[PDB]
């Protein structure tokens, strides 16, 4: 069973004038200018982040697979979610070595925990190996 | 499907602006239009009134460079194209593609003189005009403002009428003989079974 996840807006709320100037990044900032075209919500430029875009509470922070992300660092952190394998998916942290990644991936199979980084830091065994 | 055929409008006995409004709407509906005899269209007002209107139009000209300015075409086919273009969207691909499907010619050229002609009842002068309201043909106004090919169209039209006068005379003779031969078949004794169906549904 997996509920239908509804995203009210899949675009990005890019900062005003970020498309014209390289010094202005794309991370959102509220236009506070007295004469600003966007904060006055003129026609055409009337797109600001509001709480009305908030996604449903039931499916908020839900991965496309229907589970939730649980960052793990070693084999013991898998035991924290072994009782909720239908709710949480493992996610090995970016700094975990390739050797420890094998133990986390191997143990998660035993405890039936889905891992979303199951193909990360694989050894040279792709071509002719 | 696809509309590969051309709608040929005989602009004789029609009003310039009412023809343009209907065509400009259908050009946006994907139809292909040819308006033959775009010089026989009628406009309201006497020649003196129309010439004054032309003079006002001729005044609009870029002061610093007349070659950039408005171009005032005198050919009646270009008079209609100006009218139709004003009723189509401006400066977008939709309005350029619509205008690519329209043509007037001052007469009936070689392919369009043997095509089926259509009429716009909304644009007919006999419907939208008081009979005593004086009108002007686009050709007569065109000559008064400098259209040099008025008598070329008259010569070409005179030949076209005399060629169609004998084509219609010859075709009438064939149709009269065919209609008689159809009457002998309908009244024939052996065709009773087929004719009975025709009469029962009002086709005979």
């Amino acid at each position: 069973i997996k509920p239908k996840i509804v995203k009210k807006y899949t675009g990005h709320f890019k900062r005003f004038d970020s498309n014209r100037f390289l010094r202005v990044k794309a991370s959102w900032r509220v236009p506070r200018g007295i004469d600003n075209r966007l904060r006055r919500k003129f026609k055409g430029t009337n797109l600001l982040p509001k709480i009305g875009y908030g996604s449903a509470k039931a499916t908020r922070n839900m991965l496309p697979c229907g589970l939730y992300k649980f960052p793990v660092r070693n084999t013991t952190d898998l035991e924290m979610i072994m009782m909720q394998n239908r709710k949480y998916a493992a996610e090995i942290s970016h700094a975990v070595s390739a050797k420890k990644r094998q133990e986390i991936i191997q143990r998660a199979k035993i405890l039936n925990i889905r891992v979303l980084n199951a193909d990360a830091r694989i050894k040279k065994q792709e071509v002719a190996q | 499907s696809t509309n590969n055929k051309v709608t040929v409008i005989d602009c004789h006995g029609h009003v310039l602006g009412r023809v343009a409004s209907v065509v400009a709407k259908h050009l946006l509906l994907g139809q292909k239009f040819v308006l033959v005899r775009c010089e026989d269209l009628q406009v309201c007002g006497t020649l003196k009134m129309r010439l004054v209107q032309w003079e006002l139009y001729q005044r609009k000209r870029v002061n610093t460079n007349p070659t950039r300015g408005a171009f005032h075409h005198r050919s009646p086919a270009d008079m209609v194209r100006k009218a139709v273009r004003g009723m189509l969207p401006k400066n977008n691909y939709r309005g350029k593609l619509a205008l690519k499907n329209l043509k007037c010619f001052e007469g009936c050229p070689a392919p369009y003189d043997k095509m089926k002609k259509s009429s716009i009842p909304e644009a007919a002068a006999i419907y939208s005009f008081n009979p005593t309201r004086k009108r002007t043909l686009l050709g007569e106004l065109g000559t008064a403002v400098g259209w040099k090919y008025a008598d070329v169209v008259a010569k070409n039209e005179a030949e076209r009428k005399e060629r169609a006068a004998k084509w219609y005379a010859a075709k009438q003779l064939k149709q009269k003989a065919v209609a008689e031969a159809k009457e002998k078949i309908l009244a024939d004794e052996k065709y009773k079974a087929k004719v009975a169906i025709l009469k029962k549904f009002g086709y005979a």
Partner: protein, 203 residues
């Protein structure tokens, strides 16, 4: 006892915790996906609860016009309704139309005013058992690969029974030829000529 959230799986010489059971006492359980129930099979003559109500114009023996699907524009003769599916059982007599016995939903047909006078039609078969028998099914999932020829083969075996059941057509074919011009009407495709507007058409 095993907690309801615990389903142990065999470890292939991997390192396991102290609490996890060993492989010598772990039995693999098949993954279970299907949890609903298939539709129950009832008596052949009883109608399904999901029986579509037919239009008043569609009566046995009426000549229909198929306006959608593979045989669009063809004309068929309506026999009866498939009480197990709600679809119409129509024979566009194969000697005339080339349309065999089939099932078509009533929303893809137009009922005409013509009639064929279905009688002694011998409909002993022609039910849900017959249409399921002649259905060309797919090649399953694990049953080898059986490429190319598999679809061709079924048509060969199903042909001898499909042809046989056309004994239904023997009555309707004879009755079609009785009415003049009806035979030509049935074979030809139905078309909208110039000037026929569907909102003004009475069939």
């Amino acid at each position: 006892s095993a907690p309801q959230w615990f389903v142990p799986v065999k470890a292939g010489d991997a390192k396991v915790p102290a609490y996890y059971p060993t492989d010598d006492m772990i039995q693999e359980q098949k993954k279970k996906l299907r949890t609903r129930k298939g539709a129950k099979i009832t008596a052949l003559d009883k109608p399904a609860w999901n029986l579509e109500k037919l239009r008043k114009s569609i009566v046995p023996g009426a000549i229909l016009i198929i306006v959608a699907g593979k045989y669009a524009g063809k004309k068929v003769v309506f026999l009866k309704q498939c009480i197990k599916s709600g679809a119409l059982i129509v024979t566009g007599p194969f000697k005339i139309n080339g349309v065999p016995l089939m099932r078509i939903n009533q929303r893809y047909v137009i009922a005409t005013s013509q009639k064929v006078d279905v009688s002694k039609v011998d409909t002993t078969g022609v039910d849900v058992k017959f249409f399921k028998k002649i259905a060309i099914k797919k090649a399953a999932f694990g049953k080898t690969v059986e490429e190319d020829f598999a679809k061709k083969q079924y048509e060969a075996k199903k042909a001898l029974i499909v042809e046989k059941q056309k004994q239904v057509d023997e009555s309707v074919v004879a009755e079609i030829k009785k009415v003049p011009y009806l035979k030509e009407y049935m074979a030809s495709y139905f078309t909208l000529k110039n000037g026929d507007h569907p909102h003004l058409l009475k069939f």
